[PDB]
Amino acid sequence: QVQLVESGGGLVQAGGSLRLSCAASGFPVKTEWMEWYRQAPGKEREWVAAIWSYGSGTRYADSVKGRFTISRDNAKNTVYLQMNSLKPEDTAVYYCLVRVGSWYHGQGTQVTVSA
Amino acid sequence: MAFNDLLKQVGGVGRFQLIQVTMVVAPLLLMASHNTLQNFTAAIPPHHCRPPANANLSKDGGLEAWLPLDKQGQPESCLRFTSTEPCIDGWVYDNSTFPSTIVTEWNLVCSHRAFRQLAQSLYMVGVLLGAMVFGYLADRLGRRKVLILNYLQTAVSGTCAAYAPNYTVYCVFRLLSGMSLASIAINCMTLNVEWMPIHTRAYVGTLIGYVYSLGQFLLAGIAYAVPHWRHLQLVVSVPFFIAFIYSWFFIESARWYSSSGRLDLTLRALQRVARINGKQEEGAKLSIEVLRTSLQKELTSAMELLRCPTLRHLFLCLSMLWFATSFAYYGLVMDLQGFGVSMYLIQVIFGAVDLPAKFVCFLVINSMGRRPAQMASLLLAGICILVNGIIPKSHTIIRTSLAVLGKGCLASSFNCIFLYTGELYPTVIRQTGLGMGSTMARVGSIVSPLVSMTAEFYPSMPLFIFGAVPVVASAVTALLPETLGQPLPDTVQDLKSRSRGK
Lengths: 115, 502
Ligand SMILES: C[C@H](Cn1cnc2c(N)ncnc21)OCP(=O)(O)O
Ligand SMILES: [Cl-]
Description:
- Chain B: InterPro entries: MFS_dom, MFS_sugar_transport-like, MFS_trans_sf, Orgcat_transp/SVOP.
- The structure holds 2 protein chains of 2 kinds.
- Chain A is mostly beta strands.
- Helices cover 0% and strands 45% of the residues of chain A.
- Chain A has a 6-stranded mixed sheet with strand order 2-10-9-4-5-6, with no helix packed on it. Chain A has a 4-stranded antiparallel sheet with strand order 1-3-8-7, with no helix packed on it.
- Chain A starts with a strand and ends with a strand.
- By secondary structure, chain B is mostly helical.
- Chain B has 2 domains: 1-31 and 111-300, Growth Hormone, Chain: A, CATH 1.20.1250.20; 301-502, MFS general substrate transporter like domains (Growth Hormone, Chain: A, Up-down Bundle).
- Chain B has a two-stranded antiparallel ribbon. In chain B, strands 2-3 form a two-stranded antiparallel sheet.
- In chain B, helix 6 packs antiparallel against helix 20, helix 15 (309-333) runs antiparallel to helix 21 and helix 18 (371-390) runs antiparallel to helix 19.
- The complex binds ligand TFO and chloride ion.
């Protein structure tokens, strides 16, 4: 079986920065896709960002450019998120997805942007 | 004293040789339109999985939650989220530019997307089957009768394909449409060249090419006017019906009539052609006793072609050339949706580029020769479409210009290979050689959709195969001798002497 456990939640004031990552097990992170989603309360799943395999490319959404940064590593076989200048509308539960239209999605982390 | 003697005696420029020729070559416009139509009647519009009706779109934050996205900012065209799972509730197609296409009607997307190209493959299978079977039937039975039958079958198959309930019905009716269409295409040319003197065959060929280019123009315009596929197929097939209604005034081929060993009806046809031409004083002397005295010298296949080593080698080479040229040409023509620009404009440019390319190859063959023209045209076409395959979608104008140059190069290559096989094969087996070359060209046009079938592997590999084939053909056709000096061999003895004497 494949695990996609993740961690990096916390309570932090607006304009701070967190440390988010997905612990990928059973597959090399450099060989498949990667994606990112949030489900803010009162809203639905929203696409955030994606990084291809072997660093082919990385594209963002309208509220991700210039604010968030996502990187990868090979030693720990994980995908890591960095962010700054957080705003109250960013309060959401973030879900890690291994591939587009893929059956392997993580448990999710709860991150709060307290104005 | 021969058939040409009588034909010149009756005329050659009179009203008959214009009216009959123009009537029989009018449907070549729809020839081109029907051959290319699959591009316009089966264009894939942007599409995505449909969220289930039970789910509330308003309460789920819109359709963006149920549709995973790809790189180009569009929803995924085959998958959907489970709150994954493939399409199970159908599909959603935008109507911004396509009211309806066969892919829109019968959801030939994601899984079982092969059918939108299997349809063209089956149509080309029908073309080849009709060509060979109805060539045999025309040899056995006649020309006017088989051409009329092809007219009717084409019209019926076009209408039936326009109104097709299922998909297998559509494929079978396309197969029968090709069955009739190859036969009409070959028989129009054979009747025109059999009812004209020797020194007008080049004129007939040039007119056929001009009508084909005008057919490309007409298809572009008719696609601009009528976007709906159900209306488009019917509107492009009903003029065949009106031409079948008005094509009962055709005059059968007198040469084939004389070739049957019987001459009374041949005399009747020649008398009729004298009446319509308006020249009766000169045609009065025509009677039975002059037919035998004028037509007696000429009265007196695969196995022999494959037996002789020189004949076998010449076959293999020419078959490879025809196969590669037709394969690449139809692979390039059948795919114009993925060029960025509107299909109508690129189709217009493809049609327009025919005449300048024809002038270029004519100048080259009348100036330098044929084999260098083959090399240049094939190599340039292969390189151009390979670069098209290697240039990403982000660039549009350069890709379209490269595709236009490639289409022009393929047209010039077609004209050049026709002339080269005309002035290459010995007169003993020249007609059978042309038939085999045409059959191999139809085989290549059959395979081309099969090659484009497997684009699921790589995004642009079919373009790579289309660009790899003609470079191989040009490399392997190097050994072929050049016939600029007009040797015009008759039997296999001349070929070996000419090759040794070259
Ligand atoms: C002058 C052309 C030469 N030729 C012979 N075969 C072909 C194919 N398959 N495509 C285009 N052109 C071809 O024939 C008249 P047609 O294509 O059937 O209107
Ligand atoms: Cl043909």
